[model samples]
Target: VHHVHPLPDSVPESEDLFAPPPRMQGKEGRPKPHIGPNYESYVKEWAKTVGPNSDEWWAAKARETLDWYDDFKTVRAGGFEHGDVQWFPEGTLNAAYNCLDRHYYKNPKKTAIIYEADEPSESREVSYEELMQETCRVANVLKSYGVKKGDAVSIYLPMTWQAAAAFLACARIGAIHSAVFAGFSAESLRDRVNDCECKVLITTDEGRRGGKTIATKQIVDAALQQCPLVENVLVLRRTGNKVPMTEGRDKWWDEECAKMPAYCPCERMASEDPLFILYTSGSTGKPKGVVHSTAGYLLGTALTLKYVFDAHPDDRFACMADIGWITGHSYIIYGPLANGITTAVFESTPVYPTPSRYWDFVDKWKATQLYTAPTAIRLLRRMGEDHVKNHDLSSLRVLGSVGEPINPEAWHWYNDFAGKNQCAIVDTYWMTETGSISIAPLPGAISTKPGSATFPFFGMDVDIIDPQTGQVLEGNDVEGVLVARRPWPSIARTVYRDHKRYLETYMKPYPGYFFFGDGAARDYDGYMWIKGRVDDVINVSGHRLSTAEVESALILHKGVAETAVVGCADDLTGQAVYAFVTMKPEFDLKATKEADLSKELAIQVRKVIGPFAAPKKIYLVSDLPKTRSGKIMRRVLRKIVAGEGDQLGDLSSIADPQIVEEVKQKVT
Candidate 1:
């Protein structure tokens, strides 16, 4: 049903341009999508319209750092191949100076951080000048604690002013920071600590939001018990919870910050110097720590923010994501700060007090570019449209979506109701290891394909590979692994100290390309449509969860023999975890064992991983689908649990495919 778009200007145009196609060819044997019109021209116009100055700026800045990049060794700088990335490697630069001193030091009174707390009792503001003071003060404290350039610091705090300060402080001293999400349970925290062996730990007293209390200090304490190398624990008194403090190990943040100077200058870091490490959960084993450097990451952020978000010095932006993830690191803190955009930071979830909490903040701050996830959009959409009624959303200019492939219904809803069909939606697609934004539709410069991200933004060459066959596919087609064939500015250097894992995961799988675990397809003119995660992982809400991970969580129940976890269709939450388990004969559900098992297992998952990992259902099962080799046939099991019968292939080779059908019959 797709057709070419005719030029709107000329006089001799036929009505066929506006008419629908009549039973056209649909690329038989390949996945076909109705990508109407000339998508390429639309993207060109969109990109040029939104970021004319941005392109020039990137080239100029890139040339100043590395002549190789300026000479155009390739469209992108460096990518995964046989070794670590050198993204604009020869470039020499300072990240802190580029972000703060170059932009903010001049205009101190301009808002730097617009904060909305969980209480909603008050909204605080920090100007660039004041932010500099706070950053310098925190930097001085780090200096006093013997932190220097190249040292690794672990930040384990909730989203707050202190979290912002920690980032700046790390940058001031050029310390590599690994921010563990405050939502992660004690075990997850310990894993990160042990993996990185971070010299110092940064956390808060406690945090409360959405009617749940996060005793971050308690989790830190529990994790620190197992992590012996951790020399110091810097704790901020956010919730003012009763905490146990020890000498040498525990240092109060307020006291330490108060003792430092307020005007420390930014330290210069090499363009290739490691800056931060972010971890993505492993499908089989431990999570991989994706390490990013200074100059390239800042450059990419600056470039993407200016172009994709259409950000300006005068614009006020706000992103609802935690610093533990790549989105927050790039958008909320690093990217916007690099460009000196007055960005909003909220310490609360949107639907905490009311579903309108987000709109309230948007109206209050007059946010120009609002970045959020498809999960939040669904949650807000379910609460009904009236929830956003009467809220003046006209100030919103560029709307952003990330985390997962956006459904067309959700995408259109975002355009019609959220943006009043006026603002553009930039569908961003990247990964923890991408360093900065990789694939996205340019809002102002490119014509969007509703649910599709469309194409690589700039200087990024993305390819779609068939996961099963490992063959590259082309044209207006789809349903394959999304792999990046080239490197762009800000690609991750390596997994922190784990070059082997980095090579194997991204480079080894596909030589000279970066593997983005998600599956995607391409439409005509090379537009991209992300399907979802192709790996064994499941995306619940926006969080990536593994069936193996949840199964292991269920195995914690004393009576469990075998467990199978699969994703099921959920109305509001995108996907829900459905677990089928076999229990010991002694284990009973009517008894406290059954009731206690569910409660204990849910709590166990939350305590070991994060609240997001908890399963939706825990059904006891006798057996699971397996192959002749005893390998678990997770594919068939997943389909049966999801009730997607027609999609299931022949089960002749399965060990117990019928068991899954038996489990499905009892789903009600």
Candidate 2:
């Protein structure tokens, strides 16, 4: 029933656990696949992969996915060692045109997007012809508002078709769009809006999620109080809940579209020009604006979506993520659209009316490629697999896991229940900084383990290196920090307006390699198993969390004196936040037990940061183990929470090593 993709010295001791039903032949399975030639047939046929560090491989991939208006004098240029790498040198094309009109020219009637509303009864489909017209209309409206080339437009909208139009329209012109998640707080939104000095903001009057209305325009109003540079607020009418709109600044989307003609020329830009700025949490309290380029990002995502996901012109691709996030930007919009296929955009939660929602969606649309997070998979599993039983999921050919690594239990459960033991699971590993999927498996081309991302994408050279020495380990069964040996098309060029911080955060670290800010392991066969963020960051429900950020938020409580946060292993969400805190001497503990204080800390984090960053457990400690230099020993805390204190070696030098034992005694 299962087959091993044999690689030299790479097979696990327990072979059965690492292998799965070999390449889904729809209803059939296959024999054991060889390492080299078996996968080469698929790789060579589609996007060729010569080796890990081959420029030739990258060149071929670019040509396959990218349409170059200018013939490149050289296919590849630059390297990480020099801190200067550019793909497809001298190539020129508009990213929007490549994604939209290129396909529309062949067939205007081709379905471009299928928008499923939060309420199932209401849905809409847009053809390539309509999408182009709407994009042009929005582009015209933005122009009328004095939006010029290279300006920033803030898009804070829901998962509706209008969001897609706003994004592509920005790309259609040369203006950059920074999409902030609609669920973020006014404070969060305000900071990002001000950071980019956004000229215009696109938002809905109100957004309907899970049958509840969110005052999106009102939230924009609160954020706009601090954003003086913003001159226009374009509002889309979603729920029709009446709200105050400033007469001069706010404009209605429908009225503006009615006034504008359906024509705006796409701006031709260089390959290295900025496309969009997607924010990710920094180790510091601020959010890092990771900038992705036009041609390189377009080429990279398209290549992976096609080769890794096996995206076809007839296949319907759906990624369950908010359009604000990078996952949705690349997969939901540009990547799938560039290939000239239909993309399914669901505006509903996974289990709103019922857990059967996604299953019904798959059958209704004949979705073949499905991409979602591990948290959703586990949540659905808890509700029971029967929800999707009767629905025809037989059309599913590829299932992908992103955000964070899927636990083995959840992974197998997902394959058995959702895949019907027939779909191939691509455990993807990447970040906002990487721009697109960097490390993942190609169906039939690579063998998979339950939790491993498997291998690097074409042009990507991922290496496990010694964090201390910065030297790459030789081979098999080695583990350490993860780094990119070479720069690829999609890797974020720099953090917006903070090249020094970007250099220190990524390039300057370990000399030559680009620091990925995570830990990983390489098996004998060279498949990568991401060990999670090695820095002060945590992964909760696919959202990146910075321990320092949470700690900063924790200290805002009147009773808190000091706080330390660490991620703990959890079966459901892969990892859960655990925090330890010491209260000020003025606070009295007579009225409550540790449980009461724990509850308060969780609430404190929620109020300061967001509901998503709340800790699963909060421990009240008298002291934290620290170095003589006053650095809290999180490594010691991690081992204690994992119940692996037996392996916690040589803490004798720590200033308060005894605190470790004391905390363990009282830990829940």
Candidate 3:
């Protein structure tokens, strides 16, 4: 995979080049505000920050690890592996084998997790020794259930030590784990379970988050009914909330651990073994399960956590990301585990019960390295800066932001709130498919811009290209599609069970290079500025939204949330983007629905993405079912005119799903 450079001989006279090629008279021009004002300053800053000899700093610490990994007798993959491409080809190791066993041998009694419940009650800690023994016992239980290498298990639980252990145990036994967001509706869970056809489901009786209890087992039971392939249900009694449990079909985790010996040995796996299947919000159509393999994924994620994040061994690192998402898998579970670093995970939502919940947690942990999304800062900003003033947040040093791009204002807010004006802020840019932080600042190793990713990581080749024509955009002062020129170690191999779709999604469009599907504008100094995803997929809070993720929430009303997840023009958020829903029932019957269901649904989405992405308005819709094939004509809604009607597409394929008439009549 390589970026096609149409002009290679056009090198600038100055070594530190930061200008774009001369524009052609007939070619299409870039959008208004063509280039950033600080392009030259950005280039100089990048060189000063990440120049050679910076490896002595934490940013270059990855080389030491990568060097050891490359020479390790057990290491099998060298670079990246995808589908048939085996990474670290000569290495031999296991994910859990690396994450748990290595640490157990070194220090057994070190605290691994600091659990804080939603109500700030019944919290406990788990040590490396306890985590290892518990994981081994679970591995034995998995073996008893006939789960073998390559078997996929769906972990539908919340932010407890149990969920963390379940993820590691999956890695230990060579089983692939797909942990779905607990906030997802039964339909989303069922779709994921059926998509992967998971044989085992690891869930809890109930889950507590932000002072609310989620019926985890009830949802899993509903989803598993449609998934006939499921053979076992491993239930963790988180809140001791009793629910129906089948004798042979379901087994309590306590009872299972009671049965299995804690000394079970972790099995070693090949580097290319499927590590996990993470499902992104399905925006294009049906959800696609992105498959990430071991070895390279581990290396990729661990490398970033060590260098880019500068997560020291003695530090208390906290990532405000759900284990259900890829960030949590890579940064929280796999990366930190591989590094044998003590990490902390929280079970409560950052903004639950109170706006200062996050600040409260920070003070409790005295956190060193903190990571979160920009949307959170936006919401917290409105909550008032006074919230953070009461807390002692001087313990924090490294700050990170992911998900949607951080606006300049939000970036300053984070720096002031957490950093208190001194700590470094790393606005990282990567996706679920990439597996790790690809473009970022290597704290102290490189000069970082307030919003720009300093540079590409080692072994990554990134470039921008014109979207209309796939020609690579060269030099600075350029805006185009962002792409990786080659397959890096952490890149996802395929969308589970659908190699052709993977090719169609990533490869088919541009040939060779992996497509980010996001737009980017570069400065003359070659600094990359991610312009967010160019697709309809909305990233609210941290939850990735395809129409499907939104529609899934809508369907819970007995009317699907599907019709309009789009960002219509808005004064706030720059995209108020209305959700014009059409309900199946009338106002009277709908009134009998959940009291303030609409508000709850919007708040429900806040749990999904965080509150910043809460829909400005979520209408209840009656119709949204697609044709025999799944397809929703959202284009009409996107192309609405001020005075006239929306440009509805061909209705030959649509049935009752398009509630155009119902919505139009209700618009007044």
Candidate 4:
């Protein structure tokens, strides 16, 4: 609520953002339309069913989407405020079985994963049968290591087909899998591994991205030194780089799978059982482990994929996200597979050997749907139009933007270039807390908007609430904090081992409503336009970095005395980290060059977190504005960083009001 801004009044016509295609054509030359042109009536019907007997609507959706071992008696139980919300409580099923076995049974020869490697010629495809065999083998391997139901397994692998297999394997054995992003440093991996108390760690020998080899196994070795509870390390040979492996604890993935059977029984887990724990940055220094339930998460993702993306039987879905992030977990892996769609697993950056890498991938795979972050669109847009024009993106029917809000300029370029004005651009809005896309356009159903997410998905009771009064604002053209009135199936159940923190962060903030931590506005046309995060979270290039997390990383440097981090608007990245710092008395500022010290501080954060979390700019200061109670007034610092110093409201409450002027002078 502190830093949230109001939305602009101008609403462009639908044609400006490129109108939705009349019909989406699949690979087989068949037209598949998800919804009719009457979008108002369709939404009204959904709201009528969901508003009264929400359980009945959810039950029907679950039945249609998933194959459960046992049917649920109650669709939902408890409420969000009570911290006991459960969906399909009596149902039992294996996520791996739903994602693989059922689909394999239907058509074993159907391609499940199209693994696009860093190099063009190295790409491979895996059929549903092959994926099932691989997953079963991995499951057997984990079972041999004594990993039972409810056990936690940490996977630190790149965007390979094996990374997808690893998570399926964990699900088959009923183990809660936490996949850490491969780009994270060993220290960051170590903290996540210890937090979830992972007994087994899965990684690769080396990772190849952008034609460079990363020492993945070596980083795991460094992390395992402090992770005493980890009993086994499963290493996949990606680049054949020889590294030191612990004799008893380390095992080769190929050799282990070779020793195991091709078929393993799927473990039947209760609906309320923990599916996975994903760590997301919080307002505090430590990352929050967001826990999602099995049935609810699976159902939600599958349903959203079907309706939102309008996935056809012949569609090849490509979601360019690392396996570590929530976008990958939902769209790339779980959601697509559950719908029995062919997914393109990308293992390289958009700009690899050439700027045309992504376009070439689409041409090669003939992907019918492409879901990616706005950061990539901005980068590719700057690279020139020839790269996109060279490739055939005709197969793409639905184009999507996620992670951060897409600007009107990037949105138009994406539509004009990659989509060729024939595809439907669905800008989705959701978080790790929401298992799937909560607010987005339903392609053919919802009309296009330049920068608006448009409307809420089915069962997402979205509302704009006044943060001060804690009352829902009723009317169009009003800006306020975004919230959901009722609990949805895919919503995160709780924070792992810290239910109270989850309650405080999401539930307790607005009492009855579930806070989204973002600001929004309902336009005259009733389309929801997303304003970025209102909390301490900074979304830099679609990656959420907490202000406290960045501050902690900066403070870890011996030269830094104190620091305050804030997010500033950027053209390329949606937001960039801007840090204000104060040097310790013992570490003389004159002793080291200012530029050298700033570089050192950035490297410090890279070592602690990852290179992505490093600050874009660092400003040295003599003192930071603070209250008498010694709390750093981030609001004042945020204003100064945003160049809104003129609006620095009443600094009389601060201990040193003079510090604001000093900071402004230094910044100028």
lDDT against the true structure, each candidate: 0.69, 0.76, 0.66, 0.81
Tens digits of per-residue lDDT for model 3, 227-276 = 88988999998889789998799999999999999867656676677889
Query: How does model 4 score by TM-score?
Result: 0.81
Per-residue accuracy of model 4 over 186-254 as CA lDDT, tens digit each: 777787899999899999998988887768898898888999999999999888878988898999999
Q: Is candidate 2 or candidate 4 better by lDDT?
A: 4
The sequence of per-residue lDDT tens digits that candidate 1 reaches over residues 176-273 is 88887776667777888888877798899897767577788887888888998888888888878698887878998889888887878766566678
Q: Pick the candidate with the highest TM-score.
A: 4
Q: What are the per-model numbers of colliding residue pairs?
A: 14, 1, 33, 0
Candidate 3, overall lDDT? 0.66
Ranked by TM-score, top first: 4, 2, 1, 3
Worst 10-residue lDDT window, candidate 2: 1-10
- Where is the poorest 10-residue window by lDDT in model 4? 1-10
TM-score of model 2 (CA atoms): 0.78
Cα error, candidate 1, residue 271 (Å): 0.8
Pick the lDDT winner. Answer: 4
RMSD to the true structure for each prediction, in A, is 13.3, 11.5, 12.8, 11.3
Query: Model 3 clash tally?
Result: 33
**Stretches of candidate 2 exceeding 4 Å from the true structure:** 1-23, 26-53, 81-83, 282-284, 536-668
